[PDB]
Symmetry: C3
Subunit: 603 residues, 3 copies
C-alpha cells in the first residue's frame, strides 16, 4: 500500500505516473545499484537505451570511462557543477547518420545551378538534407588528399529525377566524376550545461556533435583531452554559444579548442578560446561526407594559441569564411574567398601576421584590421602567401584600410606572394594584389607594399593580372618603400598597375644666361615599380600679384617674348626633375614655382 502507484493525484493519475513525467539520474543509479562514486557509463547507456528523452542530473562529479555514443535525440538538464570525468578513455559523441541514396546525373555549375538530376530520386523529398560529395582525393584542393569537394543542400522540390535545391551551387560537379548523393538523418542532442574532465592523453574529443542542423549550443566547458575540446562535425546551420572549450595538451597534429569540421552555415557570436595550438580550428577530416567548410562567421571572439601558430584558423578546405571584430595571435587564411575584418592581429614570433599557406583561389580580404608587429618582417611579410600547387582560380589579396603598427626594417614587406621552388612549372592562374583604403603604417623603414615573384628569380613568371597600391600612408618620414617592388613578374608585359599619385612644389630662381632653369632632382618618398607618368607646371608664388608678360620680359614691346616652357627633365622609378626651357636666355633672375605630379594608372 506504500507504493507510489497506490497514491492518487487529483488528476486521476497515480503518484508513480506523476514521477514518471520527469527522468532523473538518481533514480537510475538506485535502480541499477550503481553508486554515484562509481563509473556511471552503464547507467548513461541504459538511460539512452530506454529512450529517455530528457534527463535531469544532480550536481556531482561522475566517472564516465566509456565513450557514450548518442544516436537518437537526447537532452540533458544538468545542475551547475555536474562534471563528467572521462579520465583516459571516456567521451561523449552525438551523431546523426547518412546513407548513399544515389549519384549525380547532370552537371552542376558553380554559382549558377539550383538543381541537379540524380540516378534515383525515390528516397528524396522536400526538406531533406542531402550531401553532394566527390570521393576522389584532392578534388577540392591539391594540398591534402582528404580535401575533397562537396556541399550540403536542402531540397526545395523533386520532379521525376530532378532535384531543385535552395541556393546556388558552391562548386562544379560533373556526372563523369565520382559524385555520390547522401541523405542525412540529423540528431538533436541538447544540453543546458555540460562540463567535462579528461586527461591530456585521452584521444576522444570530450564532446563531438556530428550530423546536426538548425541549432544553438548550450554552455560547454572541458578540461583536458589530447586533440580538441569540442568538435562540431558535418553540421549545417548553427550558432556556437559562449563556452570554455580548450586544449592544453602537449603539441600534436591538432590541439584545437573548438574544431569546426566540415560544416556549412556556422556563426560564433562572441566568446573566447585558448589552446596549445589553434583556439578555433576550421577544417575537418576525410570520411565520406566531410565537405569543405563554407559560410562561417565568427564575431567578437578572442582567440589565442600558446605555441607560435595562430589563435584563429582556416585550413585549406575552408572558403566563404570570416573572422570579424576578433583578436588573434597570427592568422591562417584558408582556401580563398575568406576575410579577416576589424580584427586585432598580433605578429607571430616567427615573423608575419597573416599566412596564406594552402591557397586554392579567390579573394583574401583584410578589411580595416589593426596589426601589431615587432620583427623586421624580412623573412615573412605582414601578409605572406606561398603557392606550392596550381591554383584552381586566380588569387587576389585585398587589403583595404586599417593600421599597421611596428618598427619594420630595411627589408620589411606588407604583402608578399611567392611561388615555391617546389612547384617546378609555370603557374596557370594569376595573382592580383589590391592595397587601398587609407591603410596606415608607422614603420621606421619599409621595403615594399606589394611584391609577387617566383621562388627563383627568372625561372618562371608568376602571372599577375593587376596590382593596385593607390591609397596608403607611411606615417614616418624615414620610410621610403616601393609601392610595388620591381622584378621580372611585376614588370612583365601584360601586368597592369595603379600606383599612388604623389605631387609637390619647388621654388626655383633663374640665373643670368640660363637657357634652362632646373629644379634639383626630387627623390620620391614612395617609389614606383617603373618610371611613373609625370606632369610639370610653372606658376607664381603665393603672395604675388597675377603674372602678366612683364614678369619674364624687361620690355613687353620686344618680341619674341620670353616664356617659361615647363618640362620634366629626368624621370626614374624614384625621381623627377621639373624644369623650365627658355625660348630666349635669361637676362633678369626671377623666383617662381615649379609643380609636379607623378602616378601610374594602367587598368
Amino acid at each position: 500500500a506504500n507504493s507510489a502507484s497506490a497514491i492518487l493525484d487529483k488528476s486521476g493519475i497515480s503518484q508513480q505516473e506523476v514521477n514518471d513525467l520527469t527522468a532523473h539520474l538518481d533514480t537510475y543509479l538506485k535502480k541499477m545499484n550503481i553508486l554515484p562514486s562509481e563509473d556511471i557509463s552503464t547507467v548513461l547507456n541504459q538511460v539512452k537505451s530506454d529512450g529517455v528523452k530528457k534527463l535531469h542530473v544532480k550536481s556531482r562529479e561522475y566517472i564516465v570511462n566509456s565513450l557514450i555514443e548518442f544516436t537518437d535525440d537526447f537532452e540533458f538538464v544538468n545542475e551547475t557543477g555536474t562534471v563528467f570525468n572521462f579520465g583516459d578513455t571516456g567521451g561523449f559523441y552525438a551523431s546523426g547518420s547518412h546513407t548513399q541514396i544515389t549519384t549525380l546525373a547532370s552537371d552542376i555549375v558553380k554559382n549558377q545551378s539550383q538543381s541537379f538530376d540524380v540516378a534515383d530520386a525515390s528516397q528524396i523529398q522536400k526538406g531533406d538534407w542531402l550531401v553532394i560529395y566527390c570521393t576522389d582525393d584532392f578534388s577540392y584542393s591539391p594540398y591534402r588528399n582528404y580535401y575533397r569537394k562537396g556541399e550540403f543542400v536542402e531540397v526545395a522540390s523533386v520532379s521525376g529525377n530532378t532535384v531543385k535545391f535552395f541556393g546556388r551551387a558552391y562548386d562544379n560537379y560533373l556526372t563523369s566524376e565520382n559524385i555520390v548523393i547522401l541523405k542525412v538523418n540529423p540528431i538533436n542532442f541538447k544540453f543546458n550545461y555540460l562540463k567535462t574532465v579528461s586527461t591530456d592523453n585521452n584521444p576522444n574529443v570530450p564532446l563531438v556533435i556530428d550530423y546536426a542542423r538548425n541549432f544553438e549550443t548550450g554552455y560547454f566547458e572541458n578540461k583536458g583531452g589530447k586533440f580538441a575540446g569540442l568538435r562540431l562535425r558535418r553540421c549545417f546551420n548553427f550558432n556556437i554559444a559562449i563556452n570554455s572549450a580548450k586544449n592544453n595538451a602537449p603539441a600534436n597534429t591538432l590541439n584545437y579548442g573548438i574544431q569546426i569540421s566540415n560544416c556549412q552555415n556556422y556563426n560564433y557570436f562572441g566568446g573566447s578560446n585558448n589552446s596549445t595550438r589553434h583556439a578555433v580550428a576550421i577544417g575537418g577530416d576525410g570520411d565520406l561526407g566531410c565537405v569543405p567548410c563554407r559560410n562561417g562567421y565568427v564575431s567578437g571572439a578572442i582567440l589565442h594559441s600558446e605555441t607560435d601558430t595562430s589563435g584563429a584558423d582556416m585550413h585549406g578546405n575552408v572558403e566563404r569564411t570570416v573572422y570579424d571584430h576578433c583578436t588573434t595571435n597570427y592568422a591562417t587564411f584558408g582556401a580563398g574567398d575568406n576575410e579577416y575584418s576589424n580584427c586585432d592581429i598580433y605578429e607571430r614570433e616567427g615573423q608575419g601576421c597573416v599566412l596564406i599557406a594552402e591557397p586554392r583561389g579567390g579573394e583574401f580580404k583584410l578589411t580595416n584590421n589593426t596589426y601589431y608587429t615587432k620583427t623586421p618582417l624580412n623573412s615573412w611579410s605582414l601578409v605572406h602567401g606561398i603557392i606550392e600547387k596550381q591554383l584552381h582560380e586566380d588569387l587576389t589579396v585585398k587589403l583595404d584600410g586599417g593600421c599597421i603598427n611596428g618598427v619594420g626594417g630595411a627589408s620589411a614587406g606588407i604583402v608578399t606572394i611567392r611561388q615555391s621552388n617546389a612547384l617546378n612549372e609555370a603557374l596557370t592562374k594569376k595573382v592580383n594584389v589590391h592595397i587601398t583604403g587609407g591603410v596606415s603604417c608607422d614603420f621606421d623603414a619599409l621595403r615594399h607594399w606589394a611584391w609577387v615573384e617566383d621562388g627563383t628569380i627568372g625561372r618562371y613568371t608568376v602571372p599577375i593580372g593587376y596590382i593596385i597600391v593607390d591609397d596608403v600612408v607611411n606615417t614616418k618620414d624615414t620610410a621610403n618603400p616601393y609601392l610595388i617592388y620591381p622584378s621580372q613578374s611585376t614588370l612583365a608585359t601584360n601586368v597592369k598597375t595603379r600606383q599612388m599619385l604623389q605631387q609637390g612644389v619647388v621654388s626655383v630662381t633663374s640665373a643670368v644666361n640660363n637657357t634652362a632653369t632646373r629644379a634639383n632632382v626630387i627623390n620620391l618618398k614612395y617609389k614606383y615599380s617603373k618610371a611613373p607618368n609625370v606632369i610639370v607646371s610653372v606658376g607664381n608664388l603665393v603672395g604675388s600679384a597675377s603674372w602678366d608678360a612683364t614678369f619674364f620680359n624687361e620690355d613687353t614691346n620686344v618680341e619674341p617674348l620670353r616664356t617659361p616652357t615647363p618640362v620634366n627633365s629626368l624621370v626614374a622609378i624614384d625621381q623627377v626633375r621639373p624644369a623650365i626651357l627658355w625660348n630666349k636666355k635669361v637676362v633678369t633672375p626671377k623666383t617662381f614655382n615649379l609643380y609636379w605630379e607623378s602616378g601610374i594608372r594602367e587598368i
Copy 2:
C-alpha cells in the same frame, strides 16, 4: 487515505501541493478524459484559461485543430519531438493588446523631436509602450494604401500633457493629421522548443507573436502553412533565435519563412531560412498600429527563395534596416536608409541582383558585397530602381567597394535608376549615385557604371544632385564602359559629377619640318559623360640624362631657342590627343614622352 493530499512532504506541504508546483499536459489529459491521440485544442484552451503560467509537455505528436489564442503570459517547456499538428485549421497566436488613449496635440519633427503633447495624458506613465499612428492611407509611402506612418516609443516622463520619449522621432507628424496615440499591454509568450505541422492549405501562420517587447525567441520549427511559417508582428526590441521557419506552399501573395510585420528594433544574429518566396520578408499589414519597420539588423543568415524572387527582402514600408554578412538570391531594398553589406548576392534568373521597386527616399547602401551574375544585364542592371511615384526625399544609391562577378555584355549596367512612364509628371526630389571604394568588376563587356533617366528620353528630366564614379576597377582589358552614361538627365545644367581620373604616357618622335608633333589619338578605357578636363605635359625618357637646352637645339647660342609647348590637341568623351606645338620648326628628330591626365571634379 490513498490521495496525494494525505501524504506529507517534510516541509509540511502535502504531496498534492508538491505536485501542484509543476503543470504537465498529461495530468490535464487524464482529468479532462482526452486521449493523447485526440484533438487537444480544448485541453490547451483549458490550461491557459486556468491561468497556468508554465506548462510541461511530453514528447508526442498532438492534433490541434483550433486556433489557440494566447492573450496572457504563457510558457511552454516542451520535450524534443513534441509536435503540434494543426492540420488544415489550427495554429497558435500569442498577442498583447492596444487601446487608443489619445491624439497628438503638437507637431513632431523628424530626427529632432524627443517629446510631444497629447490631448489626454491621464493614462500615460513612464515606461509605457506607446504607438504613434496615422490612420490615413499612403501616409508613409505612395506604393500601397496600408503603408501608413507611425512608430513605437517608450515614455521617459510625463509633465501635464507633455510626453517626453526616449530617442528621436523617425518621421514628421502634425496635429492637423489623423494621428492617434495607442498604449500597448505586451504579452510574454515563451517556449524552449516549438515544432509544428500544418497543411499547405492552412491559412493560419503556425505561430504569430504580436505586441511583445524585450525578448529573444526559443527554438521554432514549422512544416507547412499556406502563407508564412513564423510571424513577429508589432514587436519592439527583440532578437530572433536560430530556427527552422519555412514556407513550401504553392505561390501566393506571401510565402514567407519568417515575416517581420510592422516591427521596430529587430536583430537576427545567425541562421538560415528557405521559402517558396521570401525567406525573411520584412513588411507587414494594415491594421491599426501596423507601423513601418525600422532598426532591423540581420547578420550571418543564409536566405533563399525557390521561385525567382529574393531570399532577403525589404518591402516599401521598411527603413533603417540592414542585412550584413548574409547570402541571398536576389534582394529587395525597401523604402530607403537601408543597407546590404558584406553579402553574397546571386543574380535572379530574370536579370539583376538588387531591386529598388518601392522607393521613398534616403540612402540605399551596398557596402562591400560580392555579386554573382551570369546574364547580359541588358534589361535589368546589377542594381536597378524604378521610380513610379513621387519620392518623399532625395534618393541616393551608394555602392562602396565589393566584387562584381560575371560576363556582362555590351548593354550591361551596374546602377540604373529610371522614372516609370506611368509617372507622367516631373519628379520633385533628386536622385544621386555614388560608386566608389575600389569596387571591382570582371565583366568582359560593360556599357555603364551609372545611369539615371526618364522612361521616355526627352520627356522629363529626372533631377540629379550628384553622380560620383571615382574609384572602380574593370579587370578585363576588353571592358570599355561609360563611368556615367550620357543622356538628357545626366547632362542637365545643374548636375555635378566626379568621374574617375585616368592618365598615361606616350612616346613620340618629331620629324624634320614638324611645326607640331602629335601623339596618335588615345581612346580612353573608361568613358566620361562629357569631355573631361585634360592635363598634358612633356618630358624625358627613363634612362636618359637630365634635359638641358641642347636636347631641342642644334646650337644653344642661336635664339629664339626651340622649346616643346605641351597641349591637348583634341578632346572627346572618350579621347585625348597630347601634342607639342613648336616655336620653330624641327630640324633634328627627337624621341621623348608626352603625358596626360583626364578627370571630372564638379562637386
Copy 3:
C-alpha cells in the same frame, strides 16, 4: 505512515527522495513559516546557506528588503511574473572572490609580452584567471585617480616563477611599479528570468554580477534603483542577453541602464536600453582589481538617455571597444583605440555628436556612421575633443565614410581638437586627423572639415603628425569649407597634410594685342590650409578638329611660331588663375580651354 518518506518510487528511492531532487521556494516558505506576502530575505538567505544549487520560484511578487549576497554558485528557475521587490533597501549581489597571491617580477611590454615572472608562483596553475593590477592612482589615465592600469589574463603554463599567459599584454607594467597579482575564484550565478522592483532612492543596483567568466546572461528586467539597473563588474568573457535594464531616477553621478564596470572581453549582440543618463555606461570604479575595460563589442543596440548626455558611453578607462550598428543620442569616446561604426548618432541639444573628453591616446575611429544634426555646430563640432592632460600616446581621429546631415552654419566644424587652457604646458605627444572614404555632408554652410589648435592661439603649438582630408563631399553648392583650417598648429613646420584634389576647365578667348590671356580668378569650393600645388594645361574645345600649327598662326611659314605657354598666374589658399603667356602678341582672337588641378600631398 502518511509521510512521503513512507512511499516507495519504483526505483527504490522514497517519494521524499524524489521530491528532494527539486528545490522550490514554496517548500521553504512553509517550513520556515514565512508567508509569501512577507519579506522573504531570510528564506533566500537560508536556501543559499543550505547550499541549494537550483531553486524554482512560483510567480508572485515577493518583498526582499535585504541585500542578498551570493558567494557560491546559484541558479534561479523563475516563472514569468516572479518579481523581487527590493523597496528602498534590498538588492541582489553575486560575486566571485580574489586574493593577492604575488607581485610582478619582470617587466611587461605592451602588445609584445606573453609571459611574466612573479615573486611566487606556488599558487598558480594552468587555466587560472589572474589580475595584473597597479595600485597607484592615475596609472592608466590622468583624468581620474581611480583610472589605474591592469588587465585580466588566463594562465597557459607555469615554469618555476615564469607565468606564460594566453594573448599579449595590453599595457606596460614594470617590476619597479606597485604591480600586484590577484587570483580569481569566479562565481556561476544563473537565472532564466529575473525581474525586480526598487524605489528610485534604493542605492543598491538591483543586480550586480562580479568576478564571473565565460557566461551569457538570462533575461533581466528592473524598475527603479538610484544609480544603475544592472552592473557587470570585473567580468571576463561574456555576452549580455537581451534585457530591460534601465534607470529612471533623478540625475546623479551615475544613472546607468547597464554599467559595464572594469570588464574584459564583453559582447552585447542586440538590444535596447533607456536611462536618465547613459543607457550603457562602460567604465567602473576603483577597488582592487578594477582594471580598464577592453575588448568590448556592442551590436544592434538602441541606446538613449533622457538628459542631454549620451545613450552610448565609453569612459576614460575604456579602450579596444566598439559600438557597431547602434543608435544613440550623442556619444562619448573613451580613452582611445575605440570605434563607432555603422551607427545612427543624434546630435545633443548642447551641440555636437561625438565627444572625446578623457583622451589617453590611440585611434578614435568613426566608420560609416550617419549623423543627424540641427545646431550651427559653432561651439562644439560634429566630433570634438578637448585635451586637458598629457596624452600617453599620439591621438588619431579617423573618420572614414558616412553621411553627415543637417544645416550647419558659417562657423560649423566636422572635427575639432583643442588643447585646454588649463593644460598650461606644451603637449608631448601628437594629434593626427584622417577624414576620408567619401563621407558626405549636406550642410548649407561649413567652416572646416579638420582643425587642431591650442586653447589660446599662439600660446603653444599642439604637435600634429598628419592631417589627411582627401575624399569628402559637400553636397550643397553654398558650402565653402576649409579642408584644414589654417592657424599656428596646423601650419607648423613639421606638419604634413593631404588635402583633396580639385580640378576644372575654363574657356578663354584671346584678344588682339594680348601678350597674356588670363582666365578670371577661380575661387575654389574647398579651401586649403596653405597655397596648394597647381597644374595648368591648355587644350582644344570639344567638337573641334585636332590642333595643328595653323590654330595659333596666320602663316605657319612665319617663324617664330606662336604657341600658348600655360601657367598658373596667381595662387592663394582659396584661388587659382590659369593663363597663357604668348611668345608673340596675338593678332587673331582664338577661343580655347585652360585646365587646372590643385592639391596638397605631403606625407
